Structure formats: structure tokens, C-alpha cells
């Protein structure tokens, strides 16, 4: 089958790990364990085709920012996650995007913008603002909740389609 190398990036505490464990194990982890760098493997069916997702879940913590180069070289697609009650994390998508482009020497890298934690009542980052950001970058925008599982498959599967 075709293997897709997916990389999940974003700021501390946005739900990168909770999204990923939802995809792999279908369960929601309420507990913060800070990620260094973890790999997960899932054989799935997308658009009627069997394929393998090789998923790297990365560190939000800036102390590991020197490891970014390496996973930016190896990844085929990037799930760019922010949390909808975390302005800084939305703004940080810019820094992630810029580094990706510089490492791949390209403006067209498969990428999906993920607005996580859409189950939450109040929010500080507008849906419109995110839709605009994704239209600027020419990439899809998906609203997710790792807690409810909303949009979880959609987000990863959409990144796969972008790699194709």
C-alpha cells in the first residue's frame, strides 16, 4: 500500500497528542504529558484505498525547536494545529509554515490548518479569521475536537488527500 508520512505540529497544549491518540486508539486523553517526539502507525481506508499512516507527534515546547529541521525534511504533510482559545498558537502557525517552506525549499507543501477544541464554549480565535488564514496559504481548514472526536478522521484524511 501507499505510506503517508504525516507530521503534527503546533504550540504547547493545543491537542496535537490528543488528536493523534484519538486517531490511533479512539480515546481521549484528559492528561497533559509533554511530548518530545512520538511515532504512531495506522493502516486505514481513505477514498476506498488501503493505506498506511506513519504519524509523527511533535514537541510544542520551544526547548526542542532545534529538532524541527529533521522532521520537516522527512515529512510529506503537516497538520498545523492551533487551539481556538489560544491566540498565540494560531499566530504560531506562521512560524511553523515559514520553517517548513525553508526546509523543503518550496511554497507548495501539503498542509492542513486544524482549529482544535471546538467543543469549548468561548473562543478567542474567529472561524472567519482561520478560514482567511487558510485561504491566504491555499490550504484546507478543518475544525476538530479531540474530546468529542469531531473532525478527527476528516483532518488526517484531508492531509492525505493533499499529499496526493
Amino acid at each position: 500500500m501507499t505510506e503517508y508520512k504525516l507530521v503534527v505540529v503546533g504550540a504547547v497544549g493545543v491537542g496535537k497528542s490528543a488528536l493523534t491518540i484519538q486517531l490511533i486508539q479512539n480515546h481521549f486523553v484528559d492528561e497533559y504529558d509533554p511530548t518530545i517526539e512520538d511515532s504512531y502507525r495506522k493502516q486505514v481506508v481513505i477514498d476506498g484505498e488501503t493505506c498506511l499512516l506513519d504519524i509523527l507527534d511533535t514537541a510544542g515546547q520551544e526547548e526542542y525547536s532545534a529538532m524541527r529541521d529533521q522532521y520537516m525534511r522527512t515529512g510529506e504533510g503537516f497538520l498545523c494545529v492551533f487551539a481556538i482559545n489560544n491566540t498565540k498558537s494560531f499566530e504560531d502557525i506562521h512560524h511553523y509554515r515559514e520553517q517548513i517552506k525553508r526546509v523543503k525549499d518550496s511554497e507548495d507543501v501539503p498542509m492542513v490548518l486544524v482549529g482544535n477544541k471546538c467543543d469549548l464554549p468561548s473562543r478567542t480565535v474567529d472561524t472567519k479569521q482561520a478560514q482567511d488564514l487558510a485561504r491566504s496559504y491555499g490550504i484546507p481548514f478543518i475544525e476538530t475536537s479531540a474530546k468529542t472526536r469531531q473532525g478527527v478522521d476528516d483532518a488526517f484524511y484531508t492531509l492525505v488527500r493533499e499529499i496526493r
Partner: protein, 142 residues
């Protein structure tokens, strides 16, 4: 049934650093090399977290000192990444492969040098780490 479930609790106890809960789970037959979905063993989680006692205990109980998770990290990669010196030492005295490569070709030295852990770099070189080792992009530790 039970045996699998002891593994998951051993993983948790090793991560959460409960030194004595580890001792019990082992004596109820738990698997010392139980894997989480990311491929970590208890020794990876204990090395990552910096729990020296738990690292010693797991090694006394036949833990695979060069086990690799799904990213290709050994426990020595994890201890080095975050500067846990005495852990790096103990792992090495128990036969850790000093030049083990992750899936991208990085040794422990690559990671220690990348994150500026100078005391780990020195101890790694004293234990036969290769200064000219290249990862899969041709890049040395520096």
C-alpha cells in the same frame, strides 16, 4: 487479559514514577518490555522522565536496554535528549549501544549536541560514540 493489563499499568507507573508500584507489577508477572502505542517500553518512559531508581529496577528485571520505539529511539536517545546524566551512565554500563540510530540515522550524540547537553556529549565520547557518525541526510552531530 491480566498480563496485557499489568503491562499498561507498568507503563503508567514507570511514566508517573511510582518506584514501588513498579516492583509489585513485575512480581505479578508484568512484561518488562510492554509497549505503548508509540512503541515506548517502561525503560523509555523512565529514562525520559529521569527516574533513575525505576531505570535501575527495570534493568535488574531483564528490560531490553536497546529497545526501540516507533521513532527508532532507544532509552539512551531519550536520556541524552534531556540531559539526564546518571541515566546515560547507567544505560551505558548495562550495554546500551552508544551509536544506535533512530529512523533518521541520529545517534544519542546527535541529540545531545542538538540540545546543547555538553556533559552528555563528553560521557558519550568516553563511551566510544563516533564523532563522524552521519545521519541519513549525511549530517554529523557537530
Amino acid at each position: 487479559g491480566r498480563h496485557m493489563d499489568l503491562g499498561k499499568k507498568l507503563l503508567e507507573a514507570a511514566r508517573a514514577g511510582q518506584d514501588d508500584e513498579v516492583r509489585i507489577l513485575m512480581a505479578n508477572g508484568a512484561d518488562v518490555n510492554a509497549n505503548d502505542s508509540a512503541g515506548h517500553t517502561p525503560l523509555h518512559l523512565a529514562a525520559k522522565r529521569g527516574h533513575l531508581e525505576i531505570v535501575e529496577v527495570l534493568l535488574k528485571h531483564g528490560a531490553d536496554v536497546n529497545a526501540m520505539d516507533n521513532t527508532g529511539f532507544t532509552p539512551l536517545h531519550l536520556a541524552a535528549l534531556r540531559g539526564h546524566l546518571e541515566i546515560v551512565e547507567v544505560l551505558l554500563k548495562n550495554g546500551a549501544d552508544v551509536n544506535a540510530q533512530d529512523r533518521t540515522g541520529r545517534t544519542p550524540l546527535h541529540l545531545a549536541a542538538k540540545l546543547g547537553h555538553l556533559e552528555i556529549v563528553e560521557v558519550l565520547l568516553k563511551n566510544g560514540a563516533d564523532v563522524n557518525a552521519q545521519d541519513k541526510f549525511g549530517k554529523t552531530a557537530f
